[PDB]
Amino acid sequence: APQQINDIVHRTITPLIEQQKIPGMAVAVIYQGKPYYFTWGYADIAKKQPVTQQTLFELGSVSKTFTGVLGGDAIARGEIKLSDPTTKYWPELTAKQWNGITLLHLATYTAGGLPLQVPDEVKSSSDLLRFYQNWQPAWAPGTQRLYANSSIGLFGALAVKPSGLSFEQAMQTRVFQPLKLNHTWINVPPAEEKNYAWGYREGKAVHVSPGALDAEAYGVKSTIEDMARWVQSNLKPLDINEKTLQQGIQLAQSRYWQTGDMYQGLGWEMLDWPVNPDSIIIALAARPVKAITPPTPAVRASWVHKTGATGGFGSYVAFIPEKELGIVMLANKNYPNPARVDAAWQILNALQ
Ligand SMILES: Nc1ccc(C(=O)O)cc1O
Ligand SMILES: Nc1ccc(C(=O)O)cc1O
Ligand SMILES: Nc1ccc(C(=O)O)cc1O
Numbered sequence: 001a002p003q004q005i006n007d008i009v010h011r012t013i014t015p016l017i018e019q020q021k022i023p024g025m026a027v028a029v030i031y032q033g034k035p036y037y038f039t040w041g042y043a044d045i046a047k048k049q050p051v052t053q054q055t056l057f058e059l060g061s062v063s064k065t066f067t068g069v070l071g072g073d074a075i076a077r078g079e080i081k082l083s084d085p086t087t088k089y090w091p092e093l094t095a096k097q098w099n100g101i102t103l104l105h106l107a108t109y110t111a112g113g114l115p116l117q118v119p120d121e122v123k124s125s126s127d128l129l130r131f132y133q134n135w136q137p138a139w140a141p142g143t144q145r146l147y148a149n150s151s152i153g154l155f156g157a158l159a160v161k162p163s164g165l166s167f168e169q170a171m172q173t174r175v176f177q178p179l180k181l182n183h184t185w186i187n188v189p190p191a192e193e194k195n196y197a198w199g200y201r202e203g204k205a206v207h208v209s210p211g212a213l214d215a216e217a218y219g220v221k222s223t224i225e226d227m228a229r230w231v232q233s234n235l236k237p238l239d240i241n242e243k244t245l246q247q248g249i250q251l252a253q254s255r256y257w258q259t260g261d262m263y264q265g266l267g268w269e270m271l272d273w274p275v276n277p278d279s280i281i282i283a284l285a286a287r288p289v290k291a292i293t294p295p296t297p298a299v300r301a302s303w304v305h306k307t308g309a310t311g312g313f314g315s316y317v318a319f320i321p322e323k324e325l326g327i328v329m330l331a332n333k334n335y336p337n338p339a340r341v342d343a344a345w346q347i348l349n350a351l352q
């Protein structure tokens with residue numbers, strides 16, 4: 001822990017925690033291929049349990065980065081293609097609006113206005129089919145981006161079908177295990193209960209509610225160590241020994257669509273480095289997309305990032321491959337996104 005990293009981190013995070021009243025927080029800075037860990041406050045306020053390097057936080061939508069890489073791994077395996085129609089992997093999807101909707105569209109929120117959430121009442125596999133069959137698109141496929149758990153969530157479920165594995169089995173065996181993420185869970189086991197932090201929404205202790213496609217969209221829990229390892233894996237994919245995982249990370253960081261200065265990958269979102277901080281610092285934001293023809297392979301000169309939130313948690317991951325530099329910020333309160341990106345910006349810009 002060099003003093004350069006120590007001082008900038010404590011100078012940035014301490015005021016953030018006070019200003020946002022965050023009960024507990026874990027931060028990892030990846031600098032020249034080594035992680036540096038920082039922890040504040042409480043994982044459990046009532047039981048006085050401190051945040052540590054073993055504390056599990058809910059990642060929220062940062063889960064979509066694991067989903068995107070797993071999908072990319074399936075592509076590398078020759079099991080799926082992003083150009084394949086959705087109907088190829090779900091033939092019961094016989095409704096005529098699904099003509100021309102591909103796995104890429106699901107992965108990148110460009111199917112034509114799939115809703116932010118799968119409705120809470122949708123539970124069975126029959127419910128899900130009925131839900132997607134009855135969905136009426138607002139736009140043609142590949143024309144507008146509308147962020148949606150029902151879009152990326154379905155991509156994840158369909159992407160693992162040719163493997164013959166469940167999503168959870170696929171993620172564990174193809175992403176978690178090979179990358180040594182031994183404390184990253186879709187479902188937290190009883191042995192890990194003590195490490196599992198409580199989230200805090202308006203003073204109330206809360207964990208993420210179960211739902212359809214939760215594992216695929218927002219259900220991963222992890223520690224600051226594993227997330228630091230996840231960042232390193234994404235910083236330097238070609239150092240990973242697994243052939244298809246290496247390629248799947250690169251596919252997930254490819255630029256498929258452009259909306260202004262933002263580029264949409266699989267899970268990951270990117271901007272050209274150097275980034276105007278104002279470009280990175282609303283319930284529904286429909287944005288027209290420019291197709292990148294063909295998609296640009298993972299650009300090392302990039303700000304790659306993803307925000308995530310659940311009711312009780314707020315997370316943020318950001319990295320710059322070119323600089324071998326990254327940050328993970330995990331907190332057990334859902335606080336404003338600009339505050340996360342600002343703090344991350346302050347730290348990484350000081351270190352680059
Ligand atoms: N809202 C729309 C939905 C689908 C199509 C299409 O061409 O498939 C076009 C639209 O304007
Ligand atoms: N291991 C655990 C799994 C689920 C929950 C929950 O609150 O849903 C809590 C746990 O400690
Ligand atoms: N005992 C507690 C005190 C304060 C808070 C809070 O969220 O500020 C939560 C608690 O469970």
Ligand SMILES: Nc1ccc(C(=O)O)cc1O
Nearest residue numbers: 122123124210211212213
């Ligand atoms: N309460 C729940 C609602 C939906 C689902 C699901 O798998 O869709 C699971 C649940 O435990």
Ligand SMILES: Nc1ccc(C(=O)O)cc1O
Nearest residue numbers: 235236237238239240300
């Ligand atoms: N062009 C490059 C691609 C990947 C890596 C790596 O470390 O994975 C490094 C590079 O210079």
Ligand SMILES: Nc1ccc(C(=O)O)cc1O
Nearest residue numbers: 273274275276277278349
């Ligand atoms: N590293 C950077 C510093 C300052 C600015 C700016 O727009 O002021 C942008 C950057 O990418």
Ligand SMILES: Nc1ccc(C(=O)O)cc1O
Nearest residue numbers: 261272273274275276277
């Ligand atoms: N200060 C900056 C202004 C514009 C851009 C850009 O990529 O358009 C980047 C910057 O660092």
Ligand SMILES: Nc1ccc(C(=O)O)cc1O
Nearest residue numbers: 208209218309310311312
């Ligand atoms: N997208 C979601 C975010 C938060 C929660 C929660 O239960 O806190 C559930 C979701 O389906």
